[PDB]
Amino acid sequence: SNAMRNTMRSFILRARSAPTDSQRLLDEIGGKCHTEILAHCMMNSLFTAQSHREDVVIHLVLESTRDYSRTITVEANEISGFHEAALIALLVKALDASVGMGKEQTRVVQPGLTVRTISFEALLGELAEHHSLYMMDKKGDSIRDIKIGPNPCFILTDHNSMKRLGVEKISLGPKMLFASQCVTLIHNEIDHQEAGW
Template identity: 25%
Template sequence: MRRFVVLGHRATTSPEFSLDDLSGATGRLDILLRCINSSFFLSHSIRKDVEIHLILQGPPSPTKTIRFVGSELKYLNPDERSTAALIRSSLSQRAEGEKKTSPGIYMSSRKYSDVISLLAKDSQIYYLKEQGHDVRRLPSFEQDITFVLGDDRDLTPEEEQVLFEYDPIEVSLGPESLHADHCITIVHNELDRRLEKN
């Protein structure tokens, strides 16, 4: 399973946002929407072996974590607006523990540190960071892997500290500093190529 964890440092935790202004008053929720697209979409299908955890840390009621599970998703389309509507619908529901809000979409109040702690039990953690090891030069990848990345802001020193408790492998993707969704596309391409060789 390939997992992505994206930190939405100021992404809204209220469903009261307009679908007409997704890059404005949502705390850059638009970045997370594009990460969903690049996590799941193949040309004519959805990647089943993928999960993404969006950690929404903005006002008014942080943290909300929304988890998308590729093998269960039914109503996902590639455009930003319809994906935003799915998130809005999730945020409008009350969750005790983790609640399914739509096929393949789950919401909880899990904090970033809880999400990482849970995922680190089953998977090697990779930290996407410009100063990391070149992804193409890593000798191999485990079957179960989790990639952690920020939205348009890097992880804070505190967020990095949480990650460092789990011995993450720091990975870079190339010489340029890229948008989060573009990073996910490149990670997939590298892993697809490795799988093909095996």
């Protein structure tokens, strides 16, 4: 193996129960669709105590729709608080800007915030090229026992087409965890591997 330099970390939250409708989104906070998890995932994936993390991208694929899913891409680099309402707000903003889009389309919302009518599977297609793709599997190999690829990208669900795309299964531990908790764990293991300890 090579001595890696620090690379982009990406995450994909497949929120299949999540409304693409701006208002039905704020409605599901604490509701059966559990819309808080998106905000926590955003928090954990982009923020530490001191700073925001450099070079992180989260893709939120909001699926529950009358037409196309909205893929909301947040980039820690250009996104100039971390509580549930403020991050959920970033979403509503991007959702409002997506209304009336047709298929296979892209709309800049603000610096480092984009919305796209791209399928989950199509999006994987694009990331599959130059990213190391990973998914969660209680029966996958412990993450502490693999060498995490460069430009890694982690599929988290709010819950073989995959094997074709080179998607490798990993596990973070014995227990079932919130997607938001998976984020912190992933980040931490790459922080270790990068630091060498």
